[PDB]
């Protein structure tokens, strides 16, 4: 909408207090101007019809239960905005600054998120699977990144292919938490599965295998559920970028950990200049070693690494 820009304040899904950038005309609205060519939220209020309304309220407070998932949503799609923008020097997921669109309130006891191929969307939960899930900075990220991909590397969403396009998502969605500094960590979705349940997570990229997830090529799964395993065997190459970063001892195979700054330029290199729609995994491998070779040179700490993790689960 036509309006100038303001600042609220609100409270997100955890309870935490945070500013939010709205535009004032009649209503305030979530509608971030100061990124690109804004980030809109919209309000999907319990249904499934898309994106919904765009999120409007009298008085750029935002402290009622119901705004709690709308503040997350849009404070968070923010965040994953500068990560792309100041790391990467990426603007926006099309990389020429496209209005960032989230809807929350998908559904009714809706657990899951996903990107439909032209906006973000968050379920609230059942309460007991998980919370709004918008509430996790990893999760909001993850969903960005499926949008990232879709204009780069535009990896087909099943068997290796699908696995790396998750993986990408899970690999972004921890480097964005890590950038805002706040309990950062190599699980997934810790800050909104589960409430019941202290100490878990949707995935873990450090030990995939803590919930059955394979960390190794030899385990990989082969049959058709979940797309042929795209949220089972991105598993895999969760684990060689974890390595990659944090170093290691994995199967007997040892990796020299070279750090997150330097797994997200090598990743982001490959997806933006290697990777194609029918990637798998053996060339993932061949474009994050080039994407090394390319950054840091042909003899580097750098490129050694990245073919020990490799190694360590099984990928060659
Ligand atoms: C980070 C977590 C919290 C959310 C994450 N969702 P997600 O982002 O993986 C979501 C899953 C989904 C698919 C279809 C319909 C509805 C939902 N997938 C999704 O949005 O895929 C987007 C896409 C579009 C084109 C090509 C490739 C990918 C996930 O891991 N979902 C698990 C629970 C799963 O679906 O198994
Ligand atoms: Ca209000
Ligand atoms: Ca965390
Ligand atoms: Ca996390
Ligand atoms: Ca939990
Ligand atoms: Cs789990
Ligand atoms: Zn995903």
Redesign the pocket.
Known sequence: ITGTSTVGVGRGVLGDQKNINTTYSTYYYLQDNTRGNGIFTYDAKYRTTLPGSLWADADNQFFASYDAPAVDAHYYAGVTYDYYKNVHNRLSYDGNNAAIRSSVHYSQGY???????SQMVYGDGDGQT?IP?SG?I??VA??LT?AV??YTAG???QNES?AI??AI??IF?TLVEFYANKNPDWE??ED??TPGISGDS??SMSDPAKYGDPDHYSKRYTGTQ?NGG??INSGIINKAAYLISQGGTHYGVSVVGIGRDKLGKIFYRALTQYLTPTSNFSQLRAAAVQSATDLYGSTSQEVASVKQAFDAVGVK
Do not use: C, K, M, P
Not at 112 to 117: H, K, L, Q, T
């Open positions: 657990n899951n998120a996903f990107w439909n191929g998980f899930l996790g990893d999760v993850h969903e499926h991909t879709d990896l087909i969403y699908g396009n998750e998502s899970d969605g997934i979705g909104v599965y949707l995935r979940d795209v949220h």
